[PDB]
Design a protein around this ligand. Structure first.
Ligand SMILES: Nc1nc2c(c(=O)[nH]1)N[C@@H](/C(S)=C(/S)[C@H](O)COP(=O)(O)OP(=O)(O)OC[C@H]1O[C@@H](n3cnc4c(=O)[nH]c(N)nc43)[C@H](O)[C@@H]1O)C=N2
Ligand code: SF4
Ligand code: SF4
Ligand code: SF4
Ligand code: F3S
Ligand SMILES: [Mo+6]
Lengths: 211, 1244, 509
């Protein structure tokens, strides 16, 4: 148990992180043509408007989230609760479409099923943690998780110690979430890197000189 | 690093522009190479398309990655004069999609054979070492034979091998030729112009072994019998560039932008030169989009409009205010001044045969062929036999010309046109009128079956002491048109508003075209022609020529052009465009294709009579010859089934036969030797006695039906085959969808020349072999499919009526998979046949019948009437009152050596065609150097014919069109006949010699040739009839001039001596089946038209995904909105169309541009893609020709009579089809019959 | 003032025979890949009709093109930068594949492999190229309305019948149809470029061809909506958008585009047009949409004016391009003769592919008619295609420029007939429309005779300028995968070097 503990929270997070960063750079430099959102909307419009917006607006609200610590827990439980519900609905709807909408299912790749399934699971887990963090309204649970995360990103050994005695569900959520980073550069998730921010301040017409 | 570049974010931001609306960036663009490397290719190869479209467009075949990937038009054709647009780029949508075939899912890769046939073949070979005897064991066993014939079109194709199919083909050919006769083996392939050597491959093999070569021009109904009738010429027209020299054009029943795509620009551009264009189509067709005026006459009634227009012209430009140009023109180039003898009827006279020199006392000083020379009056009142009549063609020289001279004194004379003003009296002559007959679907105008007209006549004293009345064709013509001439004729028009025989008011009722429109355009047209000296033209097509009365539609248009002197002038004339019939280097290609270099003659056959007979469509005939007879004809002198007329035509030497005789023609010689007489005489004696009979008399006795059929460059069983279900039943022996009963079941009158049997012989064909590159409908019903090379995988040549360029087909790569060129396929069949036949056939003697040929001296057969020798009306004189009886020696074992070498007859006899001959020894010597010669064997020393190139080079070196040297000798030969010099037409090109490799580098223009009647010049475009008019070379007609009057007995008795309106015939194919199998939805009768489609060329390209994606995705039928709404049909619904002949299924295209009353299923969408099961036959839906049936016309069987004498594709019955009617209805159950459980049900 | 050049195109609709050859040749070369098999860079439509995609001209439904706000500023109809970004998760106006047609194929192999003893003749049924499933029936295609295929009330939904009492055209005698072939307009103010969040779409400086960078495109599929001509097609398989690329690989050496050289009707004209990029926004934002046409002509520049020549040279335009511009057929038809007109100038994109309206058979009248000002030839008033229809299509509803073009065409005809038939000079019709004999004879040269060298006057894009053609000539094409193509920084993770480059630097300076 202690061995698995150090692996998943001291070692693995760095494997997934190394694969995530160098995988993105390598696929960006050698896979430009493969770097797309892979929209499937045209093949089947039904319900995409609602589904996709629920999922994206939901998951994005959660990430903007990821004033004392216990206040943050309250906000995160109701704000993150709602967003997670919108997100889970969207995700489930997007998965039902991918698996059963003839045109979408026939032109889908495996990674699209896998990555979307793991996200729906990751979202379901996230919601399931709510009742567990509810038993520690003093934000004690949240504190441990934050401690771990900070230790990991600052490259401070012993990160898993911060997780001493935290609800098991938070363990899974962390493992699945890191796994998503590991699988990131090899799935459609790369579209996230490309969020078109510069567009808001760009001149309308673009002209490329002789090069 | 593309990632590191993202840091030069702002460093790549150059100048802004448009006040901050734009930004110029200095960023990488290497990615653009992406599309660059797609465009790049290995090479471009020149090739064209071997499909019947008349396009003849040279393309650039792109090979990339060692594969054919796409194509684009070549633009390097030799440029036309500066004042004419050039031809580039040509091409069309169909052509642009050919590349798709090469590796598509429907490409034929290996030779295939029906499983059942293969199983019995391999089991038979195990018991019969000799393949011939192996085939015998199969074919002579009723159950075995049936087990594979009934499998036709029912799956089971298995992969075979060239060695296996070649042996079976040869074994089968040998067995058939040996036990029944060579003429029991046959092949069908059309339009040799699209792929000369490819056609020649099978025709040459079949000719050597004595098999029959089936025709196509008449079979497809592209042959306008009116042409041979008027000019004694199969078909000769001006090139598309010439349309640009016209200042007034009428597109009549010709969908130019759709069916002449590559040439359309000449039509759209000439409009910018001031040329007015008029479209005449019942529907708002694509061609209307390009014109200034759109006239929409009721389909099938066009002749009426033509007549009324001719009426106005004669009235205004010939009578009221005579045109100097028009008058002189008809005076010198028509038979108008020619004298016609009047026959005595009861109370009135009838127009009889034309007066001949032989009829007069001194025979007008005509010693040679006096009964074959027409007579006219000069302006001084003296009677004269003018130069040019077909009588001067043979038996003398120097007088067969259109010089206005006295045929006796060679002095200059001036023929007079009208007798009015010098007649001895006025006689009433009756003219036939059919404008009052017809079905309920067309308007009629009641008058009299016979219209009496007052004609000026003169009494003459005949050589036999009798007396008779005569009148000119001119006078007869004006009467027929209803022009009042002062004799106060109650049946002539008092004005254009007078409803009389052929007035604008009259045609308004019949056609529905406003009389004032008919007048305006007739006037404008004629006026333009007067101002430009004949630069008015009429583009015409299958829109008019596929009707049963095509001759009336055509002679109506032809008269308009003649009356205005347009034929023979650049910018004017009869522009007939249907199939790609003009194979320019003719006389160079014929000897190759029919082995005329080794044996003479071959076995040509007119296909319409052939199929009408063997697919037994006559057994269901509904049209009687009697109901087509002139009201002034002796009803009792024309009894019998339409097929009876054919049989009589055959035994009289008018039309060819196939099979020819009811006894194996290879055994006649052996019987003649025993009898102690030479084979010919023994045959004539046997025929007289009846010991040997014409096969036509007993087509079902088991020995007079073809047994082996080769099909290539044809989709006969899914495109051209009218009476599809009949072919499936009688020729193939498979299930069929015929809906009606035959003569026997209805207890009708059985023919009087052919045996009858209640149960017709089915599955006559023992072996059907098809060559193709895609699995067509024909392939699907074949026994053996031979994979042939696409047009981008073989060498050949192509020419068209549209332009004067000769260019090639070239292999971009070797045939994919196991495919082989048609040339190599037949070369290998010949090689195998040569060894398999050993011990069965050696140096045989064959008796071959050859009908009297037009352009040969024998054309002067029966001068004044029709004499049937079987009726004892005359003796049986082969070559005059019967067909020639020729002796042909065949060296079967040497078939292959002969096939691959140019025979000795070119050197021993010479070459020629169209009535002229010349020496071609130097050409042969040149060929020995170009093709190399045989080391040894039977053909030792003869030029070789190993490759397609050798063959192509043979054609180019021999033809006058492609060899200036030959061109001068050819014009020299013709100069003998006319007495005028014509060598000046090719002298300035005598050194020109077109080589195959040169045309691969650039298409080349051909040399003016006597084979045609227009010139290949740099100052005047090619215009048909230009030579007749400018070189004074006669038209090969009785009179020598353009014949308006057809005096042959049959033409007169069938009411067509002069043109007349004839309403669509009733096929009686609907009222017998309508309602007999209700599915609950309303059914309605509609006219079934089949103009040619936009998403294919016939059936070719029809399966091409590009064409299917740009079209409606499969077989469809166009219906008017009114008709569709009446029937409850919505756009794209599954509908069923059927009649007595069969049924087809398709989806509807509801449209406003289709007039109520007519439906259009564009020609050839065939039977292999997207077709559900029929609710009427319980079988796969049929095709457009599942609802048609052949109905021959007697006037197209006339032979042994000058211009009306036989010729391969020159004359013969035609496959008309536009008069057909059908029942239409929305389908209910949509069952696919495939076990997929994916069927549908259409509601309400 | 900044001069730039582009090879524009003019299609003479009067000569179009509606054959689709242009569509087939483009398809074979550029879009036969899975993912774009339904896309037709070049497509021809029969009018009246709604087209491909269905009703593409309805900008209220599809939201394509630009709009001019009250403040006078330009904004994509899709919405401003933020509004557009807000629709990124699911483009609410995106056309579905059904709006195009579901690409299909047929099971030809069933004709080959059908088992022995089948109860009925085998046949090849349709199959979806998207799902691979059996299709019970083909219900649509890219050219489904071809030649008035469909009930009038259906085809008349044509956006161009707006403001027209169309009832009369449902009558058989008044029937009419024309053809509208079309590709990407390669606009001067493309809406696509302005509606792509990633800046993947750009207009090339040297020849004005608008391309979608296949590397940079991220598949946000907003551009598709942005294009009011619906000429950008989503490659459903690659996840990126593709569009007509004006055959730049060919144009770059001076060749015609495939659809131009393969046009059977000989209706397409290619010629350089010099324009002032600095005037683009000013012109596309003119208040009245009926002024966009003229505003654009004003943006084009006279190639023979030495003032323009010198400005062009100073601005980098190659000499050969200037030369070509001075003998440009597109310029003669758009600027001098006024025969060519833009397609839907009201979208405010400043389209560079123009059209000559078509003539048509005279309409139905009481009688055979009377000789008009043009004799036996038609007067512009007698043409059957309602001129108002052509105007909605080419001039924002203004019939004046359309009548002028149609009249001049007829005028030319009248003059040429006088010459070639009556052998007389007669400039009455020409003077009536304001053309001189010289202009008429030249119009005739380019329109009627139309020699290959006069239809296409394409100059080189000069790929040697500001680049290094020598090492490219020596090494382009060896696609072994050096992984160094596409970037300016030489550093690369795979420690490699460019095949078509010189890395051993000269030490002798
Ligand atoms: N794209 C394409 N091109 C091809 C072919 C093809 O299969 N596809 N095939 C070749 C061959 S072999 C032939 S025989 C011709 O194309 C036939 O074309 P054509 O335009 O003469 O006949 P069609 O029978 O189509 O008739 C033309 C139009 O005339 C109208 N029409 C039909 N019936 C009539 C009638 O009775 N009277 C009058 N005045 N018009 C009538 C109709 O609009 C039709 O399209 C030729 N090139
Ligand atoms: S199919 Fe015929 S018309 Fe079409 S491109 Fe080929 S040769 Fe030309
Ligand atoms: S027509 Fe072409 S350049 Fe213009 S907006 Fe559309 S895709 Fe962009
Ligand atoms: S190729 Fe030319 S004539 Fe044919 S449809 Fe295309 S633009 Fe029109
Ligand atoms: S919006 Fe831009 S990201 Fe691609 S799909 Fe269109 S070019
Ligand atoms: Mo034909």
């Amino acid at each position: 148990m202690q061995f698995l503990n150090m692996f998943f929270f001291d070692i693995y997070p760095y494997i997934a992180g190394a694969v995530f960063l160098i995988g993105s750079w390598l696929r960006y430099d050698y896979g430009q043509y493969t770097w797309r959102a892979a929209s499937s909307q045209m093949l089947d419009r039904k319900g995409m408007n609602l589904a996709s917006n629920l999922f994206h607006i939901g998951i994005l609200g959660i990430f903007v989230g990821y004033l004392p610590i216990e206040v943050k827990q309250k906000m995160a439980m109701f704000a993150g609760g709602a967003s997670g519900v919108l997100c889970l609905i969207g995700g489930v709807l997007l998965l039902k479409r991918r698996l059963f909408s003839p045109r979408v299912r026939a032109t889908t790749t495996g990674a699209d099923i896998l990555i979307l399934s793991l996200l729906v699971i990751q979202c379901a887990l996230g919601l399931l943690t709510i009742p567990f963090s509810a038993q520690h309204m003093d934000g004690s649970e949240m504190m441990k998780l934050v401690g771990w995360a900070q230790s990991v990103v600052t490259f401070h050994g012993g990160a898993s110690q911060h997780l001493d005695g935290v609800a098991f569900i938070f363990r899974l959520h962390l493992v699945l979430g890191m796994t998503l980073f590991l699988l990131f550069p090899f799935s459609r998730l790369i579209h996230i890197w490309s969020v078109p921010v510069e567009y808001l301040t760009r001149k309308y017409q673009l002209v490329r000189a002789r090069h | 690093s593309k990632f590191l570049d993202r840091f030069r974010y702002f460093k790549q931001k150059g100048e802004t522009f448009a006040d901050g609306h734009g930004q110029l960036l200095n960023t990488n663009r290497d990615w653009e190479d992406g599309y660059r490397q797609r465009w790049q290719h290995d090479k471009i190869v020149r090739s064209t398309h071997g499909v019947n479209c008349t396009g003849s467009c040279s393309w650039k075949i792109y090979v990339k990655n060692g594969l054919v990937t796409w194509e684009t038009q070549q633009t390097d054709y030799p440029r036309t004069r500066p004042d004419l647009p050039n031809h580039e780029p040509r091409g069309c949508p169909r052509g642009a999609s050919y590349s798709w075939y090469l590796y598509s899912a429907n490409r034929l890769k290996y030779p295939m054979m029906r499983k059942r046939l293969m199983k019995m073949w391999r089991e038979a070979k195990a018991l019969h070492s000799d393949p011939v005897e192996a085939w015998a064991s199969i074919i002579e066993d009723a159950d075995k034979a049936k087990s594979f014939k009934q499998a036709r079109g029912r799956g089971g194709f298995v992969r075979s091998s060239w060695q296996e199919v070649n042996e079976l083909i040869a074994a089968s050919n040998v067995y058939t030729i040996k036990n029944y006769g060579p003429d029991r083996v046959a092949g069908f392939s059309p339009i040799p112009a699209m792929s000369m050597v490819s056609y020649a491959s099978g025709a040459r093999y079949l000719s050597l072994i004595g098999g029959t070569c089936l025709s196509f021009y008449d079979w497809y109904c592209d042959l306008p019998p009116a042409s041979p009738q008027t000019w004694g010429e199969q078909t000769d027209v001006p090139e598309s560039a010439d349309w640009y020299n016209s200042s007034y054009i009428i597109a009549w029943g010709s969908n130019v932008p759709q069916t002449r795509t590559p040439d359309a620009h000449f039509f759209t551009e000439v409009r910018y030169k001031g040329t007015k264009t008029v479209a005449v189509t019942p529907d708002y067709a694509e061609i209307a989009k390009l014109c200034d005026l759109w006239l929409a006459p009721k389909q099938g009634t066009d002749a009426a409009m033509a007549l009324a227009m001719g009426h106005v012209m004669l009235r205004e430009f010939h009578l009221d205010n005579p045109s100097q140009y028009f008058t002189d023109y008809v005076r010198r180039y028509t038979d108008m001044p020619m004298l016609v003898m009047l026959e005595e009827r009861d109370g009135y006279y009838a127009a009889g045969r034309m007066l001949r020199a032989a009829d007069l006392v001194d025979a007008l000083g005509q010693e040679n062929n006096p009964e074959w020379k027409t007579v006219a009056f000069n302006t001084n009142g003296e009677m004269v036999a003018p130069n040019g009549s077909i009588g001067f063609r043979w038996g003398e020289k120097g007088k067969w010309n259109l010089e206005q001279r006295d045929g006796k004194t060679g002095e200059e004379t001036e023929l007079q046109l009208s007798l009015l003003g010098s007649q001895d009296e006025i006689a009433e002559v009756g003219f036939p009128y059919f404008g009052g007959d017809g079905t309920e679907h067309f308007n009629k105008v009641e008058l009299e079956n016979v219209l009496l007209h007052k004609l000026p006549v003169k009494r003459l004293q005949l050589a036999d002491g009798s007396t008779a009345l005569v009148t000119t064709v001119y006078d007869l013509t004006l009467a027929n048109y209803g022009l009042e001439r002062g004799l106060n004729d109650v049946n002539c028009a008092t004005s254009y508003d007078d409803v009389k025989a052929y007035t604008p008011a009259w045609a308004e009722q019949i056609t529905g075209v406003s009389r004032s429109q008919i007048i305006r355009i007739a006037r404008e047209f004629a006026d333009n022609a007067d101002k430009t000296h004949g630069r008015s033209m009429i583009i015409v097509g299958a829109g008019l020529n596929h009707w049963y009365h095509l001759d009336m539609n055509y002679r109506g248009l032809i008269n308009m052009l003649i009356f205005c002197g347009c034929v023979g002038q650049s910018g004017g004339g009869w522009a007939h465009y249907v199939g790609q019939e003009k194979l320019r280097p003719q006389t160079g290609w014929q000897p190759l294709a029919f082995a005329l270099d080794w044996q003479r003659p071959a076995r040509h056959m007119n296909s319409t009579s052939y199929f009408y007979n063997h697919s037994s469509q006559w057994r269901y005939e509904t049209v009687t010859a009697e109901e087509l007879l002139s009201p002034m004809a002796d009803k009792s002198r024309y009894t019998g089934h339409l097929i009876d007329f054919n049989v009589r035509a055959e035994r009289m030497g008018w039309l060819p036969s196939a099979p020819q005789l009811g006894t194996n023609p290879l055994t006649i010689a052996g019987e003649a030797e025993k009898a102690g007489m030479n084979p010919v005489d023994y045959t004539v004696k046997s025929l007289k006695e009846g010991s040997i009979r014409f096969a036509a008399e007993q087509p079902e006795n088991g020995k007079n039906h073809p047994r082996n059929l080769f099909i290539w460059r044809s989709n006969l069983l899914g495109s051209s085959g009218k009476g599809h279900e009949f072919m499936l039943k009688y020729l193939l022996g498979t299930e069929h969808g015929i809906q009606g009963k035959d003569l026997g079941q209805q207890g009708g009158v059985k023919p009087e020349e052919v045996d009858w049997q209640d149960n017709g012989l089915e599955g006559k064909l023992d072996l059907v072999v098809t060559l193709d590159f895609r699995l067509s409908s024909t392939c699907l019903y074949s026994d053996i499919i031979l994979p042939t090379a696409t047009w981008y995988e073989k060498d050949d040549m192509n020419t068209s009526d549209m332009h004067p360029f000769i260019h090639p087909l070239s292999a971009a790569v070797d045939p994919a998979w196991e495919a082989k060129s048609d040339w190599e396929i037949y070369k290998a069949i010949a090689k195998k046949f040569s060894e398999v036949c050993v011990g069965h056939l050696g140096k045989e003697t064959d008796i071959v019948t050859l009908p009297i040929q037009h352009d040969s001296a024998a054309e002067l057969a029966q001068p004044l009437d029709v004499k049937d020798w079987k009726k004892g009306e005359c003796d049986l004189i082969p070559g005059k009152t019967a067909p020639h009886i020729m002796v042909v020696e065949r060296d079967y074992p040497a078939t292959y050596e002969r096939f691959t070498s140019i025979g000795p007859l070119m050197e021993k006899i010479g070459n020629g065609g169209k009535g002229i001959a010349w020496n071609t020894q130097s050409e042969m010597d040149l060929l020995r150097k170009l093709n190399y010669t045989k080391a040894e064997g039977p053909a030792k020393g003869q030029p070789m014919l190993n490759t397609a190139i050798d063959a192509a080079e043979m054609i180019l070196t021999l033809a006058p069109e492609t060899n200036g040297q030959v061109a001068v000798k050819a014009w020299a030969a013709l100069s003998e006949f006319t007495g005028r010099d014509h060598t000046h037409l090719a002298l300035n090109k005598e050194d020109e010699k077109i080589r195959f490799r040169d045309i691969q580098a650039q298409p080349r223009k051909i040399i003016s040739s006597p084979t045609w009647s227009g010139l290949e010049d740099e100052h005047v475009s090619y215009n048909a009839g230009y030579t007749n008019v400018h070189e004074l070379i006669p038209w090969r007609t009785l009179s020598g001039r353009q014949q308006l009057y057809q005096d042959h007995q049959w033409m007169r008795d069938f009411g067509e001596s002069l043109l007349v309106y004839r309403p669509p015939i009733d096929t009686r194919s609907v009222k017998e089946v309508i309602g007999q199998k209700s599915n609950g939805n309303q059914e309605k009768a509609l006219n079934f038209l089949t103009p040619h489609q936009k998403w294919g060329i016939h059936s070719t390209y029809s399966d091409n995904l590009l064409m299917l994606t740009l079209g409606r995705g499969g077989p469809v039928v166009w219906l008017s909105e009114a008709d569709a709404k009446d029937l409850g049909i919505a756009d794209n619904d599954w509908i069923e169309v059927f009649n007595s002949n069969g049924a087809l299924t398709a989806r509807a295209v509801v449209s406003q541009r289709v007039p109520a009353g007519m439906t259009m299923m564009y020609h050839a969408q065939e039977r292999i893609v997207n077709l559900p099961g029929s609710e009427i036959t319980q079988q796969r839906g049929g095709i457009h020709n599942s609802v048609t049936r052949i109905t021959p016309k007697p006037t197209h069987m006339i032979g042994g009579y000058a211009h009306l004498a036989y010729g391969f594709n020159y004359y013969g019955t035609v496959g008309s089809n536009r008069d057909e009617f059908v029942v239409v209805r929305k389908m209910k159950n949509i069952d696919w019959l495939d076990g997929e459980g994916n069927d549908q049900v259409q509601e309400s | 003032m900044k001069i730039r050049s582009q090879v524009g195109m003019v299609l003479n609709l009067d000569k179009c025979i509606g054959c689709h050859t242009c569509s087939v040749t483009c398809k074979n070369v550029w879009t036969s890949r899975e993912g774009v098999e339904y896309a037709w860079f070049n497509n021809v439509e029969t009018k009246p009709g709604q087209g491909f995609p269905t009703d593409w001209e309805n900008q209220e439904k599809y939201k394509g093109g630009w709009i001019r706000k009250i403040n006078g500023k330009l904004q994509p109809r899709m919405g401003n930068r933020a509004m557009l970004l807000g629709k990124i998760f699911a483009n609410p106006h995106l056309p579905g594949i059904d709006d195009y047609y579901e690409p299909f194929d047929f099971d030809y192999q069933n004709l080959h492999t059908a088992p022995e003893g089948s109860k009925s003749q085998p046949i090849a049924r349709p199959r979806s190229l998207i799902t691979g499933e059996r299709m019970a029936k083909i219900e649509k295609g890219p050219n489904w309305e071809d030649d008035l295929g469909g009930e009038f009330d259906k085809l008349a939904k044509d956006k161009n019948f707006d403001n027209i009492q169309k009832a009369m055209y449902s009558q058989f005698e008044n029937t009419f149809m024309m053809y509208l072939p079309r590709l990407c307009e390669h606009c001067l103010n493309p809406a696509c470029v302005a509606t792509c969040p990633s800046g993947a779409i750009y207009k090339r400086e040297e020849d004005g061809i608008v391309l979608i960078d296949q590397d940079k495109c991220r598949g946000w599929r907003m551009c598709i909506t942005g294009c009011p001509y619906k000429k950008i097609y989503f490659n459903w398989k690659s996840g990126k958008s593709e569009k007509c690329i004006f055959c730049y690989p060919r144009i770059e050496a001076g060749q015609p585009t495939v659809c131009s050289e393969t046009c059977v009707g000989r209706i397409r004209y290619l010629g350089v047009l010099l324009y002032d990029a600095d005037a683009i926004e000013r012109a596309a934002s003119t208040e009245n949409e009926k002024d966009l046409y003229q505003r654009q002509l004003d943006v084009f520049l006279d190639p023979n004016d030495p003032k323009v020549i010198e400005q062009a040279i100073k601005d980098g335009i190659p000499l050969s391009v200037i030369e070509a511009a001075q003998q440009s057929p597109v310029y003669k038809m758009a600027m001098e003769w006024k025969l060519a007109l833009p397609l839907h100038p009201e979208y405010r994109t400043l389209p560079m592919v123009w059209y000559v309206p078509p003539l048509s058979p005279i309409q139905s009248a009481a009688d055979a008619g009377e000789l008009g000002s043009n004799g036996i030839l038609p007067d512009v008033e007698s043409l059957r295609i309602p001129v108002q229809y052509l105007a909605n299509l080419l001039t924002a509803g203004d019939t004046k420029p359309v009548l002028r073009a149609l009249k001049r065409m007829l005028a030319m005809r009248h003059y040429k007939r006088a010459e070639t038939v009556d052998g007389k000079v007669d400039t009455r019709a020409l003077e009536e429309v304001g053309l001189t004999e010289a202009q008429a004879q030249e119009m005739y040269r380019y329109l009627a005779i139309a020699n290959y060298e006069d239809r296409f006057v394409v100059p080189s894009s000069h790929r040697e300028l500001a680049r290094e053609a020598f090492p490219e000539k020596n090494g382009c094409g060896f696609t072994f995968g050096d992984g160094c193509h596409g970037s300016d920084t030489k550093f690369n993770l795979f420690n490699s070097r460019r095949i078509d480059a010189i890395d051993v630097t000269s030490k002798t300076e």
